[PDB]
Design a protein around this ligand. Sequence first.
Ligand SMILES: [K+]
Ligand SMILES: [K+]
Lengths: 318, 320
Amino acid sequence: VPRVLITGGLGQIGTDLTLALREKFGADSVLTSDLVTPPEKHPLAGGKGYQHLNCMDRDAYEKLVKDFKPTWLFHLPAIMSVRGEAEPQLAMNLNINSTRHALDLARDYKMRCFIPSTIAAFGDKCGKVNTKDDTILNPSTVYGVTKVFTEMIGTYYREKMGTDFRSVRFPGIISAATLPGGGATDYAIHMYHCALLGKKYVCPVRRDEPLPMLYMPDALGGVIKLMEASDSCLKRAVYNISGFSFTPEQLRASIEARMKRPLEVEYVEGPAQSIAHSWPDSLDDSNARQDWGYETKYDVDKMTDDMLRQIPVLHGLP
Amino acid sequence: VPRVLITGGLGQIGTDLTLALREKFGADSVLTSDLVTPPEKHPLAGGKGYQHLNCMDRDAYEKLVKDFKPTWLFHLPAIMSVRGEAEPQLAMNLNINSTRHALDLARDYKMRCFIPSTIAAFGDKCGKVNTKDDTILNPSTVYGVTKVFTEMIGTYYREKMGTDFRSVRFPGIISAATLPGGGATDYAIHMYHCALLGKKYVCPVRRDEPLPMLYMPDALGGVIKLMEASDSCLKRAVYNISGFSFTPEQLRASIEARMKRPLEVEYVEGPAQSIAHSWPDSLDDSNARQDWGYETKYDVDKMTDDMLRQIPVLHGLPSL
Ligand SMILES: [K+]
Ligand SMILES: [K+]
């Protein structure tokens, strides 16, 4: 049974991944870490199996790996699109340096090492329709720039430093738990919230701007499946993974068809749109399907049905 | 005329560029820095116009920018291909952090900022024949990795941070002044010296491995023309520049033809070969031609003639 260290585990992915992996391998085989103690409202709060770690601090990072001796590492800490634009200095600091520490430690303590990439690695030259795994990368965000670095140094580690580095490019990840932030793709989450509170939604992404999206369980399914795969199946270190591609208009319709009551949406083109427009419309994830059996269970309507049921439950909502 | 700060100036390009700009703009216009005191026998030795700078020290970097108050920055420090495989940590430390500091400084002090990229940015997926400016980048060296980062953050600074960032992808750069060492593309220099000394050369690059190469004068031509170009001609931030491509066997033929005598070469694969194999065979530099008028004056035979006259004079090797 894998011994699992997750870093940056307070995030949506880290939280759900902690829970899935406890269920899967038992609570004692999983150690989650992040900068601060879980907030009292957060799903990991109070609970044990949690450790403080600043991933920027290499010695503390090495100590934790020497102590716990994980066989799998999930290095999740990142500054994403939004905050990345507001503080490029921080983004480059955390994303680059902590990634370098993760890889060095995976090399030295022989860990299977997952560090996620993102659709933000792509920019407007990617070929926006069914974007291939191998293509021109011209990210127009710092976050994107850092994640391309991650992709390249990680792949370098796999090819030349015998390091079992593995990665996917996450599209927009949708989740019922994630209280909805400011990030590009978070509009999807926001829309469901508003639809349940019966308020008008203010959408900063163009009505007809398509984005690759993925529902959390399929995302978690993918990450775990890739982590369980055989080195000899993996022709690549970094894999696009897809759920579905949609525009705000199509998501609105999904939600309307499900609720049989209409949802008011005002398109107010924020900086999210300019970033979104530089990203792919849809992703080709055939290398993932082929190499290691990636699959998805949720189409837009199932996700809609689920989210519209799960939010009231998790958030004490109508 | 511009005020020029060159960092990492003790390398071939730094030195040669320092001289060209001393010439072009006047010695008091140019300041050159590197980590170490210039060697005894070095073009920038002794005289003023040279300063120690550790570019990984941001405060020292800013201080020197505050003192000298340049308008042109040429950030040239880098650990390159071969040394980077041996010291990947040092390569990323300097290649990434120094680059980051120069961009920040050039933004803040409004400098036109040149930071070279390289053919090492490319990997075996680039499309190796006439490699385009826009292609798949899968570098297999630490150096290449750090230079792709350079291109992307530099391009990001240009689009979003109002920073006059400009770059070329250097092919392997040949100069008569460079003393032949262990660098990825150094075989070409070695062949020239061995020709004149009349000794056998053991070549670590495969006999038929093509590489984009460029003669120093055309390299300096390109950088200076690019650094002088009007912003509104620059459709991109980073541009392939090319001179010629050739294999070891083609370079040797050029040398033989010129010297009217055989050059003895033995091909024993060294570490340069797997690096070189992952690089383009030839570059497409049409965008540099079109946008800002990049041009070249040396083909291989004209570089061969020049090298074979220049090396005897610069190094005291036996002349033709
Ligand atoms: K898009
Ligand atoms: K080649």
